[PDB]
């Protein structure tokens, strides 16, 4: 079977053929007209029964008694005399002729289908989404008129209610009733425009025009949609999307649908509107020009439990306008206090021809409907209440259903409508039980509903008291919003093992992720012993700065719109942007370094650059507002961010525009110069004063008035010397001059013959490297406070520190061999322990020349070239691998052809690489190419096949010398162009690193540094740019920062609103409105001139 | 050549990636010295005893329904992008301001018919 | 997932078949490099036999890759497979090797020197040239890397389109 529609559903047929409601008919043909015009109660003439038994009722006699007593005439029903059977009509309508020939699923099923089977059909089979609202549109079932204004004024609003909520609209489907005008709303306003409306039409099958076409197993039945526009015929409206055509086994009688529609309303209102939201899907009724029975249908709702609100429209002067009339007459309680019944009874009969009797009984219904005037709503178009029927239909669920303030709020959340919640829920009158707004906040955060989170904070929600450890863990562990797949894998990486299957994320584990992502020596609060001794136990279970914690949450969960919102709220705004940049940057790197090929890394990199640019633009706001306070923002210790600074965080992210900003550079210049105040020509004034100490007194020094602000800060003769030598610019040149003297000596040592005992030059060289090594050990341990393992990893992340480490270790291996070698020989090169040591020195000196590139990179021009070279060498690997394969592809055949008598030796390795490598540089070995030529320098190599090798070398050089070298050059040219474009930015970032480096160094260079060591560690036993603010100036700085955040958004909005695109569009929208306003003059000007022609007489 | 290929470098490798993933998906589990066993063992199992999804006609129909929905969403977004563009907004504004200039002259014409008719009823 | 299905899962994974073919190919080249650089005797060394076995079975593999390719006419199957560069190169590499082996192996030694016999020398020299094909086929393995691959495509496009400059 494997077919749920066919297997489950049911079609009835009338098995039973009583005459047409009495004696068959007169007309002398008698038995003959019994074929022509004699039907059943079934609604079908004799040949339209067509049942297997009804055809045995076409041959001899019918299925009854001889004369068929009359309590069998009444005995026909659609319960006992109709046979259920699998269905026939279902598929997709093709409304051929209607505007792209719309499509709409359809099905023929009995009135007695169980309500759950219906729900299975709508949601499972048809793949419909469970809605967040159900609008049931009742109205007049007979072709009626509708004024042009109200037409386009209804179809703007009912559509928005079903489009802003995903509401199922419900109709009869057939165009004879209100469904025709629901279609008008759909045609105009381009009903969905990629934003589906589901409007089901539940109609009876026995009335459908062209019943036949739809018959067929899963058939695409087409359907004429252009019959006479006046002739009222039960023709399905071509703009609906779904049809449930209710069968009662009959033809030509309505009323089989009344239950199944209502049963569907019950069935949906007993479904959860959302996973967390514990309400039922709301239902509401809408009334467009109702007939008589529509009145009772209102009451039929107002009583039932739970009730159903009823929004009654106006216009057209029937049940719709009528209920609008009396709804203004009856009092607040619900009983007309005046004596004005015969006047409204008069009005009933002007709309419903009764005369007196049904008129009152029709009035008797309504006085009960006017009891429950809280579940009734009138949207009158004239004086324009509610501003919209959208909000009216929606607001009707909020008033009159005695719903808690919470239930009112959370339903707007499901719908994602703040405009209704702001205006209609948050208002004087609501009472708001103890923890309802907070539970609302949790739902809004979890569901990524930023607009409500905004609203809740404004309307009285404290994030300080809201945000707890349990609620924060519930936010990390949810799956009901935008998630980050990576986060689970980052937790699995920092938790070295695996996890039980239903592992719920812990904040300690988040803390370990944040430390991984921030790196260096960052330590999160969550990993600290205080928080642990709290957390293991679980005023203290709250957080002092919740908006810091939720920013981290939103970024780790890849919830960027929420992260941008939580950034602009709270304190520490520049830090939060810089932390966010680093977090996303590191996640981007993890994605890039994974084996997955996707767009996650470029997405996360973009998010990092978004917050990075916010931090730069905030720094420029602050700098233009107040330079001194801008510099304080760069330097204040961030207690909440591992005691770091915003400058250090920006450096951790390779955020060069922030570091290159003038404010940062001004800060760095003051550190570099110290108390020195030369504006020009400082390099040689410092050099000559290192070498001529009395020239120190001729230099310009800052006054204490100047050395007072310096927002990173921590004249007699003696203090001028102190000021000079403790200045980092001086420590640079003093270290530089000593380093150059070091190299000149060590160069002398390796070039000059080495004796038994080191020369005085060599001793000085040894002393330098030894004390330079002690310095490097101390730079690691007196580095940024952290774990020793973290300190180690950071310091070995620089190139020149790895090189210096190898340089230092190799030197003392070399010195040990050079110095501890016993001389069995007078020659001193017969001893090969000694020679090994000397050769290490000769290679070790390379490290020390290459370390001069780091000194030279202190210059603004040289520095970017040094970074170029590093990037060239670091990224050329794969081109060189290809070059090596090309080399061997030539080297191996050359050796094999030219030297065919070789036994295995390691000389084979040399010979296959050696000459081919030197060819890269243009050495062709001209007189070795053709070994059989007269001018050959290898005549003994002449032999069989040796004529091949010139052809091989011809190809090799073309590929190697021309193609491959110039590919490598092309790669290097791109590096040049990339770095040159950002050259000034590159040096300004380098400038941070060397100013910080020499700020922390001691005042003596590495030969004499030992005294600075030996004197300092006494003062600790015997007895960098970080501003330590008090809590009062800390609060002023936060106030400064929030002002500049406000000014940032203001300028952003002003720039946006001044842009030409924004001016074209507002003009566009505004000219459109005016074109109606002028037609509204062009319309009213008639009413003037024609009324003047009326008063002309 | 370098500049042309470098501009599309990630695209180039991702296309290459199709070719080698397909190549090694079809290869046997042993490399060419020992592949002979994979040969000698496989052709026995045929005598003695790539990325293609074989759908049933029912899921085939669901996929076509999925596809046509996404074709509709493609044209909708295309139309919305077009209609939001500044050029399309200048021109509709252009055409619409033109109409209004007649509609105002249609007020400026009819306002006469009012004031002059009022001067007629003034007597 | 039991023990036996983890081995099945591993070895049938295409990433594994890549590295397992790559490690065997590198070992192949290292041996064949040894064979051509070291003096060649009457009978193939054990290294040379392994080299022969690789190319023979690699050839059977290529024949089967063509016939168990995408379903079609044999003429269409052939045209498709000879549309790749490395398949044309491997075809020449395989045919030339067994021309070289036949001469190297079926040469009667009238001489003790072994380079006086010029059928033998012809075979050895073919090996020394044939090994170039097998180094250049490493570019295809290396193009599996994200950085190296585009450079390999660059080189091919350089060589393919430089003809008329070289004619000048
Ligand atoms: C034994 C001698 C041969 C090997 C050479 C050894 C020497 C050193 C050179 C090595 C060059 C190869 C480097 C790549 C392989 C390492 C891992 C790697 O990255 O694999 C990649 C594929 O790897 C391949 O496709 C390699 C194929 C083998 C090439 C063998 C010949 C190369 C040498 C030619 C002969 C001349 C030179 C040598 C002198 C004879 C996949 O990497 P991944 O991790 O999936 O991707 C990283 C990116 N991610 C983070 C986004 C995922
Ligand atoms: C922008 C740029 C700014 C400017 C930058 C400027 C940089 C300024 C840098 C400046 C200093 C440069 C000097 C270093 C090289 C000296 C070598 C030399 O000439 O040796 C000769 C001089 O005699 C001696 O050297 C004897 C003294 C031994 C100890 C060396 C100390 C030298 C002074 C350094 C104090 C420590 C400094 C370092 C501390 C770490 C000895 O050779 P000889 O006599 O010919 O040999 C005899 C041969 N015989 C055996 C055959 C007879
Ligand atoms: C974060 C920090 C970054 C920087 C790294 C910092 C750490 C840097 C660490 C550096 C040390 C690296 C290891 C060196 C090992 C020496 C090996 C050697 O040559 O052994 C030889 C000498 O061995 C001896 O013991 C005699 C030589 C005197 C000792 C000189 C080296 C130690 C000083 C180190 C000062 C380091 C200062 C560190 C200060 C902090 C043994 O062989 P032989 O005796 O020659 O054999 C003679 C045979 N024959 C007689 C037959 C001929
Ligand atoms: C990203 C990169 C990832 C890493 C990639 C790593 C790639 C891994 C690849 C790895 C394998 C590398 C080895 C191959 C080269 C060996 C040559 C050699 O050293 O020979 C020597 C060793 O002795 C022998 O070779 C004797 C054994 C003969 C058969 C060869 C099997 C060798 C192993 C291969 C197994 C098959 C493998 C291939 C299957 C197709 C013999 O020389 P000799 O003794 O000096 O000569 C005597 C001279 N005399 C006559 C003067 C006395
Ligand atoms: C789509 C697929 C893509 C790949 C292509 C796949 C197909 C690849 C096809 C490859 C075959 C190419 C042709 C080779 C012909 C050999 C020529 C030769 O050297 O002849 C010589 C040896 O001739 C002999 O018959 C003796 C040598 C033994 C046979 C070895 C080669 C055949 C194996 C092939 C295995 C191929 C495996 C293929 C498996 C599929 C004749 O001369 P001589 O005897 O040396 O003369 C001696 C004279 N003297 C005595 C005076 C000194
Ligand atoms: C005397 C004769 C005997 C000796 C002969 C020896 C032969 C020659 C041997 C060596 C040559 C010296 C260079 C070695 C490699 C450099 C590392 C590197 O790329 O760093 C770079 C990246 O990578 C890292 O920072 C981490 C990688 C290295 C691991 C840490 C070292 C571990 C021990 C050793 C193992 C590693 C390999 C070395 C082991 C041999 C750092 O770049 P950077 O500068 O940070 O750029 C930004 C600068 N900024 C922050 C200011 C903006
Ligand atoms: C990380 C630290 C690792 C290293 C720690 C230190 C380990 C200890 C290291 C060395 C100790 C060596 C002591 C002697 C050993 C026994 C042999 C012997 O005595 O004599 C032999 C020494 O032959 C040599 O080769 C000696 C030099 C070896 C060093 C090789 C480089 C390693 C250091 C590179 C830098 C690495 C650093 C990289 C930086 C990261 C021969 O000399 P002879 O006997 O006098 O002469 C006899 C011949 N004659 C008869 C012709 C005269
Ligand atoms: C005795 C002979 C004379 C001496 C030689 C002359 C002295 C040597 C000269 C220069 C040495 C290097 C200068 C360093 C400049 C600073 C760089 C830095 O800070 O970090 C850089 C690393 O930098 C490196 O990795 C440096 C190079 C490694 C050592 C190899 C040296 C060359 C030898 C091999 C060549 C031979 C091959 C052929 C062999 C046959 C970091 O840059 P990056 O990672 O690219 O940045 C990416 C940024 N991103 C995050 C946005 C992606
Ligand atoms: C041992 C010593 C003795 C031997 C020494 C002999 C000397 C050396 C001899 C030869 C060097 C080897 C290369 C030969 C030519 C390459 C063809 C080519 O350009 O292909 C390219 C285009 O073109 C084609 O694909 C069709 C052109 C070739 C025709 C088919 C081969 C017919 C037989 C042979 C006649 C042809 C000429 C060769 C006949 C000699 C294919 O490019 P691709 O890779 O598909 O690029 C896209 C890849 N992708 C789909 C994955 C994205
Ligand atoms: C597509 C397949 C086509 C080829 C199929 C195979 C065809 C068959 C091929 C070869 C058969 C050769 C048998 C011998 C012929 C008679 C001569 C003779 O016996 O001796 C002579 C051999 O002289 C030579 O040159 C022998 C080598 C010829 C091969 C040339 C390269 C072609 C293959 C390239 C690759 C192409 C593959 C391209 C890939 C697409 C001399 O030697 P001798 O007599 O011992 O010494 C006398 C001199 N003495 C007195 C000084 C000692
Ligand atoms: C013994 C010596 C050492 C060995 C040498 C080193 C090893 C050799 C190195 C590299 C070999 C080639 C690498 C192939 C990379 C893949 C390319 C591919 O897939 O197809 C490419 C073809 O590719 C070719 O045609 C390849 C080259 C043909 C053989 C000539 C080799 C060089 C010698 C001659 C030079 C000497 C001249 C001077 C002579 C005196 C297809 O690319 P395309 O068609 O351009 O694409 C256009 C796309 N379009 C459709 C948009 C238009
Ligand atoms: C992918 C690339 C393919 C090419 C290649 O790299 C990888 O493959 C490697 C194989 C290597 C050889 C293996 C074995 C030996 C034997 C040894 O013999 C002892 C010495 C003797 C002294 O007398 C004892 O007494 C000498 C060295 C030699 C011939 C190797 C040379 C280098 C070779 C050819 C390498 C070559 C560059
Ligand atoms: O570019 C800068 C522009 C203007 C200023 C600076 C800049 O950088 C600084 C820097 O750098 C120098 C290098 C050599 C000699 C003198 C200086 C100085 C001077 C200075 O100290 C200074 C003014 N104010 C303090 C003063 C109270 C305002 C702080 C910032 C400062």
Swiss-Prot record, chain C:
Extent of the signal sequence: none
Residues on Extracellular side: 39-44, 106-118
All ranges on the Cytoplasmic side of the membrane: 67-85, 143-161
PTM comment: Autophosphorylated; autophosphorylation regulates TRPM7 kinase activity towards its substrates. The C-terminal kinase domain can be cleaved from the channel segment in a cell-type-specific fashion. TRPM7 is cleaved by caspase-8, dissociating the kinase from the ion-conducting pore. The cleaved kinase fragments (M7CKs) can translocate to the cell nucleus and binds chromatin-remodeling complex proteins in a Zn(2+)-dependent manner to ultimately phosphorylate specific Ser/Thr residues of histones.
Organs and tissues of expression: Found to be expressed in brain and skeletal muscle, with stronger signals in kidney, heart, liver and spleen.
Top-level taxon of the source organism: Eukaryota
Deleted gene: phenotype: Inactivation of Trpm7 in mice results in early embryonic death (6.5-7.5 days). Mice die as a result of trophoblast defects and consequent failure of implantation. Tissue-specific null mutants shown defects in cardiac and renal morphogenesis, organismal Zn(2+), Mg(2+), and Ca(2+) homeostasis and thrombopoiesis.
Subcellular localization, as worded in the UniProt entry: Cell membrane; Cytoplasmic vesicle membrane
Self-association and partners: Homodimer. Homotetramer. Forms heteromers with TRPM6; heteromeric channels are functionally different from the homomeric channels. Interacts with PLCB1.
Role according to the record: Bifunctional protein that combines an ion channel with an intrinsic kinase domain, enabling it to modulate cellular functions either by conducting ions through the pore or by phosphorylating downstream proteins via its kinase domain. The channel is highly permeable to divalent cations, specifically calcium (Ca2+), magnesium (Mg2+) and zinc (Zn2+) and mediates their influx.
Family: In the C-terminal section; belongs to the protein kinase superfamily. Alpha-type protein kinase family. ALPK subfamily.
Protein name: Transient receptor potential cation channel subfamily M member 7
Species lineage: Eukaryota, Metazoa, Chordata, Craniata, Vertebrata
Residues of the full protein shown: 839 to 1006 of 1863
């Amino acid at each position: 079977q494997k077919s749920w529609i066919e297997s489950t559903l049911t079609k009835r047929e009338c098995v039973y053929i009583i005459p047409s409601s009495k004696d068959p008919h007169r007309c002398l043909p008698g038995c003959q007209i019994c074929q022509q015009l004699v039907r059943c109660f079934c609604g079908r003439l004799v040949k339209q029964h067509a049942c297997f038994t009804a055809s045995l009722a076409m041959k001899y006699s019918d299925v009854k008694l001889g004369e068929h007593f009359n309590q069998a005439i009444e005995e026909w029903s659609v319960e006992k005399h109709t046979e259920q059977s699998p269905t026939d009509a279902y598929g997709v309508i093709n409304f051929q002729g209607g505007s792209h020939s719309y499509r709409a699923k359809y099905v023929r099923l009995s009135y007695d289908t169980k309500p759950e089977i219906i729900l299975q059909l709508l949601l499972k089979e048809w793949q419909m989404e469970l809605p967040k609202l159900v609008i049931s549109v009742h109205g007049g079932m007979q072709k009626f008129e509708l004024h042009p204004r109200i037409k386009q004024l209804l179809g703007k609003g009912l559509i928005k209610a079903a489009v802003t909520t995903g509401a199922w609209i419900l109709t009869g489907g057939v165009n004879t009733g209100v469904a025709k005008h629901v279609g008008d709303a759909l045609k105009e306003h381009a009903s969905r425009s990629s934003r589906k409306i589901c409007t089901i039409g539940i109609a009876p099958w026995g009335v459908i025009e062209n019943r036949n076409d739809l018959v067929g197993r899963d058939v695409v039945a087409p359907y004429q949609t252009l019959l006479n526009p006046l002739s009222k015929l039960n023709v399905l409206n071509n703009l609906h999307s779904h049809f449930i055509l209710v069968d009662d086994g009959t033809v030509g009688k309505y009323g089989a649908e009344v239950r199944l529609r209502r049963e569907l309303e019950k069935t949906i209102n007993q479904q959860r509107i959302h996973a967390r939201i514990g309400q039922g899907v709301p239902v509401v009724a809408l009334i467009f020009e109702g007939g008589p029975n529509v009145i009772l249908t209102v009451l039929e709702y107002l009583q039932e439990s739970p009730p159903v609100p009823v929004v009654v429209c106006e216009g057209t002067g029937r049940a719709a306008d009528l209920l609008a009339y009396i709804h203004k007459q009856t009092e607040e309680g619900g009983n007309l206090p005046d004596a004005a019944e015969p006047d409204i009874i008069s009005t009933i009969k002007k709309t419903f021809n009764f005369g007196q009797s049904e008129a009152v009984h029709l009035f008797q219904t309504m006085m009960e409907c006017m009891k429950k005037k809280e579940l009734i709503t009138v949207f009158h178009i004239g004086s324009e209440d509610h501003q919209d029927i959208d909000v009216a239909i929606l607001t009707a669920l909020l008033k009159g259903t005695n719903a808690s303030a919470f239930d009112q709020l959370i339903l707007t959340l499901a719908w994602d409508r703040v405009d209704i919640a702001k205006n209609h829920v948050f208002v004087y009158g609501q009472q708001w039980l103890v923890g309802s707004l907070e539970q609302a906040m949790l739902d809004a955060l979890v569901m990524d509903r930023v607009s409500f989170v905004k609203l809740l904070i404004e309307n009285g929600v404290s994030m300080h008291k809201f945000l707890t450890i349990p609620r924060l863990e519930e936010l990390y562990n949810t799956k009901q919003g935008p998630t980050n797949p990576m986060l689970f894998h980052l937790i699995r990486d920092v938790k070295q093992g695996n996890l039980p299957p239903g592992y719920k994320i812990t904040l300690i584990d988040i803390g370990l992720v944040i430390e991984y992502l921030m790196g260096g020596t960052y330590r999160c609060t969550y990993t600290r012993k205080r928080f642990r001794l709290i957390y293991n136990s679980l005023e203290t279970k709250r957080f002092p700065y919740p908006l810091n914690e939720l920013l981290i949450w939103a970024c780790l969960m890849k919830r960027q719109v929420m992260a941008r919102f939580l950034w602009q709220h709270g304190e520490e705004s520049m830090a939060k942007a810089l932390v966010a940049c680093k977090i996303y940057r590191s996640m981007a790197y993890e994605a890039k370094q994974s084996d997955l090929v996707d767009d996650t890394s470029e997405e996360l990199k973009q998010y990092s650059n978004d917050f990075g640019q916010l931090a730069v633009e905030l720094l420029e706001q602050s700098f233009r507002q107040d330079e001194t306070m801008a510099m304080k923002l760069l330097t204040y210790e961030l207690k909440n961010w591992s005691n770091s600074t915003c400058l250090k965080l920006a450096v951790s992210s390779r955020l060069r525009p922030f570091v290159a900003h003038t404010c940062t550079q001004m800060l760095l210049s003051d550190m570099w110069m110290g108390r020195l105040n030369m504006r020009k020509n400082s390099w040689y004034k410092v050099i000559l004063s290192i070498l001529v100490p009395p020239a120190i007194l001729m230099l310009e020094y800052k006054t204490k008035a100047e050395m007072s602000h310096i927002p990173q800060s921590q004249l007699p003769i003696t203090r001028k010397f102190y000021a000079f030598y403790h200045a980092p610019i001086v420590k640079f040149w003093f270290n530089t001059l000593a380093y150059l003297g070091f190299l000149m000596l060590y160069t002398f040592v390796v070039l000059v013959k080495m004796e038994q005992l080191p020369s005085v030059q060599e001793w000085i060289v040894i002393a330098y490297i030894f004390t330079y090594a002690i310095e490097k050990v101390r730079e690691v341990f007196m580095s940024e406070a952290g774990k020793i393992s973290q300190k180690i990893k950071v310091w070995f992340s620089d190139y020149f520190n790895v090189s210096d480490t190898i340089a230092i270790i190799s030197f003392f291996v070399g010195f040990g061999l050079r110095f501890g070698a016993k001389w069995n020989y007078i020659n001193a090169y017969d001893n090969h322990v000694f020679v090994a040591g000397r050769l290490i020195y000769c290679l070790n000196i390379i490290f020390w020349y290459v370390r001069l590139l780091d000194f030279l990179a202190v210059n603004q021009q040289a520095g970017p070239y040094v970074m170029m070279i590093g990037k060239m060498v670091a990224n050329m690997f794969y081109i060189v691998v290809i070059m090596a394969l090309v080399l061997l592809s030539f080297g191996v055949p050359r050796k094999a052809i030219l030297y065919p008598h070789e036994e295995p030796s390691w000389s084979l390795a040399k010979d296959i690489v050696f000459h081919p490598y030197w060819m890269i540089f243009g050495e062709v070995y001209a007189y070795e190419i053709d070994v059989c030529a007269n001018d050959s320098t290898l005549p003994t190599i002449c032999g069989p096949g040796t004529w091949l090798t010139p052809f091989l070398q011809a190809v090799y050089l073309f590929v190697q010398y021309i193609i491959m070298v110039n590919l490598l050059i092309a790669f290097f040219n791109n590096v040049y162009l990339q770095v040159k474009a950002i050259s000034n930015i590159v040096w300004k970032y380098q400038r941070y690193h060397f100013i910080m480096a020499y700020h922390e160094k001691p005042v003596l260079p590495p030969p004499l540094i030992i005294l600075s060591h030996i004197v300092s560690l006494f003062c600790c036993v015997c007895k960098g740019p970080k501003l330590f603010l008090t809590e009062e100036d800390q609060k002023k700085l936060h106030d400064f920062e929030e002002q500049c955040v406000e000014m940032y958004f203001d300028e952003k909005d002003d720039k946006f609103n001044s842009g030409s695109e924004e001016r074209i569009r507002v003009t566009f929208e505004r000219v459109e409105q005016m074109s109606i306003q002028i037609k509204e003059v062009g319309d009213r000007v008639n009413y003037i001139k024609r009324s003047l022609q009326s008063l002309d007489s």
